[PDB]
Design a protein around this ligand. Sequence first.
Ligand code: 90S
Ligand code: NI
Ligand code: ZN
Ligand code: ZN
Length: 577
Amino acid sequence: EFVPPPECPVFEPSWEEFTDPLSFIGRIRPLAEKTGICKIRPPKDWQPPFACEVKSFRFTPRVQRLNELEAMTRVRLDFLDQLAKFWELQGSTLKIPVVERKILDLYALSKIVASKGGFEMVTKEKKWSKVGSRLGYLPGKGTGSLLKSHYERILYPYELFQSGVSLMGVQMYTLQSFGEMADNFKSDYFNMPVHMVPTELVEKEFWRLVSSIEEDVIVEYGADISSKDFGSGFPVKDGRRKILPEEEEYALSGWNLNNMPVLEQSVLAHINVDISGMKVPWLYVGMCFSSFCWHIEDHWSYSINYLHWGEPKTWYGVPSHAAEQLEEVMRELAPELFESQPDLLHQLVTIMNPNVLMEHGVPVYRTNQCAGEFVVTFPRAYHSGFNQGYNFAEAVNFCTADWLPIGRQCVNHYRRLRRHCVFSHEELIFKMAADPECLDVGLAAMVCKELTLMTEEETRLRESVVQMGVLMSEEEVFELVPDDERQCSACRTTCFLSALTCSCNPERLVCLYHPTDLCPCPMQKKCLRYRYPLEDLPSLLYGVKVRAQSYDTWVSVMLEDAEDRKYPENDLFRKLR
Ligand SMILES: CC(C)c1cc(C(=O)N2CC[C@H](n3cc(Br)cn3)C2)[nH]n1
Ligand code: NI
Ligand SMILES: [Zn+2]
Ligand SMILES: [Zn+2]
């Protein structure tokens, strides 16, 4: 019944193309960009050895019930819809909390609390830990009594309202053993050897199972697994190990996902300035039917995903230019609700059958990722998928010159939601501007383009605030204050260039796009806490415009200055030799 979408392009580079990954990825960009995702087959000789011992690799499995795997079911949405309207009536604007790294499933929570007699029943029986169990929350971190606090604050009043009339007060595992599991499950399921069931058939059954209430099917996986803690699946030189000479090659390869963030063309390659969460790969142990939902990368960045070993991983991809279109159809499922909670759209995990997106006009492509192949994801390319079988994968994010203006647009969009920021885009650009040499020429060029656009937009914001009637101008070093303190009262964007403070609160901030929402205290007194006194315009645009317009002229001892300034060498250095 399920209709496979068209396949995304594969790329089989030569050994020479394969030597500089990010340059090879900029070559295929104009083409792969249009499918959102794409597959990459390294030379068949290229076979890095798996660094990890499977027999002693202990991970805690998470679990998936493909029936309740879709969160945007009619019932859950209408519940949140009504619950929001309830809190509007009371004049208090539903605020959905976060528990153990992800949003609280209130619908599930009220269903369960109600199924065992309601809030006070569950309290006077102390079954709040059982609740958090059935909600999948990992014990015994105390979540039981954390839910009670939330239920009471948010759901008990609705429980009463929804209840009778009832309102008067108050208010305001081993990798080894895991393979045994997986292979046994798959064979018992299809009554075949695992390596013998065809891909197309698993694909058909998966999407069946998502919408089937007629039967329940549970599955286990592993994720939220840092290389930092568990170790990378690649060899790397960090003192943990003598690296064998058989491996030396692969420890240095730019396709080793531990080296990608640091390559000369990566944005983070020199900013030893902030833990961005992704300079460090993540591991994904997979099982038949294990799945990941539709998502885009934080700050709309690239993802690259290597399947170390195992059975294939199925993907689905959507080009960036269809991203606004993709979100639009998901929003159709509860427009009123997503009005009040714009970012709730992304917080809510979904596997929308690709067919559905296609019959709504959304381009969708697909591929089977096989052991030893890469998958690349392009900025704002939604993607999802499921595993054909037991396998093991490793992934990073990364950012390139061509991403810088997308990153800037992404903050503008996070700002127009109420979405936190993993880092300050503007800070990133200055940290790059503050080391113009040894900075890939492309970036430099792009930085200038991007930095001038910000000097403008800032000075506009800087001049607009003096009319409003602020006088004093303190000067602060934002990068040295923790993110959570330099965020905006209501944006909530990490401020770096400039923000507004007043004396009502010792430290409660607002970005310059929202200067009214700081505090009723009139603008009469200060304060525009800034970072540079508009004496940056000459300085920093210079160092970059230097290395930007030094390469412009150099092309128009010459082969020496390119070696000193660390220039690139594809067609231009070729003509040298
Ligand atoms: C960690 C950061 C860099 C990341 C991961 C992904 C990603 O999309 N995938 C999908 C396939 C694989 N996978 C995840 C689960 Br859960 C199961 N398989 C990794 N994108 N960025
Ligand atoms: Ni991803
Ligand atoms: Zn004040
Ligand atoms: Zn703001």
